[PDB]
Amino acid sequence: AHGMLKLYYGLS
Amino acid sequence: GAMEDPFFVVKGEVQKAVNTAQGLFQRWTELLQDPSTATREEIDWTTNELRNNLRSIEWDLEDLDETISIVEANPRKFNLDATELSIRKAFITSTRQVVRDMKDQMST
């Protein structure tokens, strides 16, 4: 989940 | 290079985790109430897997909650329907308490 969200949202 | 919004994907996984956790909690309750069937190993295993879920769910909600701040800080880029967004917010808040309510009836 983290990686999906990171990819689209650019989690810091 | 338009990308697909994976929020709803993770949302479903959290819900799925919440459903499994709920089944585990009802089990935990039935064990901790009657030490006739409640062997230590089974109790330990159930409490452990109930934690395994509450763990994934809390990280998940952290990340999900953050994506909301990211959209709100940069709305033009994401172009999200406002009703849909409010639903995202209500999902995070209501799941937090649902999980919170399980943790309360456990840790005490």
Swiss-Prot record, chain A:
It comes from the Eukaryota. The modification Phosphoserine is found at S12. It is found in: Golgi apparatus, trans-Golgi network; Recycling endosome. It is linked to Pontocerebellar hypoplasia 13: A form of pontocerebellar hypoplasia, a disorder characterized by structural defects of the pons and cerebellum, evident upon brain imaging. PCH13 is an autosomal recessive form characterized by delayed psychomotor development, absent speech, severe intellectual disability and postnatal microcephaly, with brain malformations consisting of cerebellar atrophy and hypoplastic corpus callosum. Additional features, including seizures and visual impairment, are variable. Component of the Golgi-associated retrograde protein (GARP) complex, also called VFT (VPS fifty-three) complex, composed of VPS51, VPS52, VPS53 and VPS54. Component of the endosome-associated retrograde protein (EARP) complex, composed of VPS51, VPS52, VPS53 and VPS50/Syndetin. EIPR1 interacts with both EARP and GARP complexes and mediates the recruitment of the GARP complex to the trans-Golgi network. Interacts with STX6 (via N-terminus). Interacts with VPS50 and VPS54 in an EIPR1-independent manner. Belongs to the VPS51 family. Acts as a component of the GARP complex that is involved in retrograde transport from early and late endosomes to the trans-Golgi network (TGN). The GARP complex is required for the maintenance of protein retrieval from endosomes to the TGN, acid hydrolase sorting, lysosome function, endosomal cholesterol traffic and autophagy. VPS51 participates in retrograde transport of acid hydrolase receptors, likely by promoting tethering and SNARE-dependent fusion of endosome-derived carriers to the TGN. Acts as a component of the EARP complex that is involved in endocytic recycling. This is Vacuolar protein sorting-associated protein 51 homolog.
UniProtKB/Swiss-Prot annotation, chain B:
Signal peptide: none annotated. Residues 41-74 form a coiled coil. It is found in: Golgi apparatus membrane; Golgi apparatus, trans-Golgi network membrane; Recycling endosome membrane. Residues 3-108 are annotated as: Required for interaction with VPS51. SNARE promoting movement of transport vesicles to target membranes. Targets endosomes to the trans-Golgi network, and may therefore function in retrograde trafficking. Together with SNARE STX12, promotes movement of vesicles from endosomes to the cell membrane, and may therefore function in the endocytic recycling pathway. Belongs to the syntaxin family. Identified in a complex containing STX6, STX12, VAMP4 and VTI1A. Binds EEA1. Interacts with VPS45A. Interacts with MARCHF2; the interaction promotes MARCHF2-mediated ubiquitination and degradation of CFTR. Interacts with MARCHF3. Interacts with GOPC. Interacts with BLTP3B (via C-terminal coiled-coil domain). Interacts with BAIAP3; this interaction is increased in the presence of calcium. Interacts with VPS13B. This is Syntaxin-6. The gene is STX6. The chain holds residues 3 to 108 of 255 of the full protein.
